[PDB]
Amino acid sequence: EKDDKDAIEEKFRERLKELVVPKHVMDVVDEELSKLGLLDNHSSEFNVTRNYL
Amino acid sequence: EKDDKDAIEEKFRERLKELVVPKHVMDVVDEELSKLGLLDNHSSEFNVTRNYL
Incomplete structure (x- = not known):
């Protein structure tokens, strides 16, 4: 299942919102x-x- | 015998239990x-x- 990965990648996205x-x-x-x-x-x-990500 | 991964995981956990x-x-x-x-x-x-483990 990719649900766990979806949560993991979402955690990467939210920190990316704090920088331009x-x-x-x-x-x-x-x-x-x-x-x-x-x-x-x-x-x-x-x-x-x-x-890399 | 039983599952190799289960036996390997259990034995490795005990070795790491003593070490910090x-x-x-x-x-x-x-x-x-x-x-x-x-x-x-x-x-x-x-x-x-x-x-490696």
């Missing part, structure tokens, strides 16, 4: 959020996605 | 323990994290 993130960063942030939802976050390449 | 594990170290152990259960028993990655 540049628009160019949003493209990487949004694509990493999408990549986070399509991966189980348990693998060699799965962990680096949240690590 | 730091907060960040505990998170690293906890996250790899969760991925240990879902990993295949004969998988090569299973041995990699088992030695």
Whole structure:
């Protein structure tokens, strides 16, 4: 289930609201959020996605 | 025998019980323990994290 991940990624979003993130960063942030939802976050390449995020 | 992950997890927990594990170290152990259960028993990655654990 992605409900636990949805809560985890939401915690990342709320802290992001306290800083004025540049628009160019949003493209990487949004694509990493999408990549986070399509991966189980348990693998060699799965962990680096949240690590980058 | 019983489940390998359950036996491995129980034995590793007892070893960490005596030591005053730091907060960040505990998170690293906890996250790899969760991925240990879902990993295949004969998988090569299973041995990699088992030695790391």
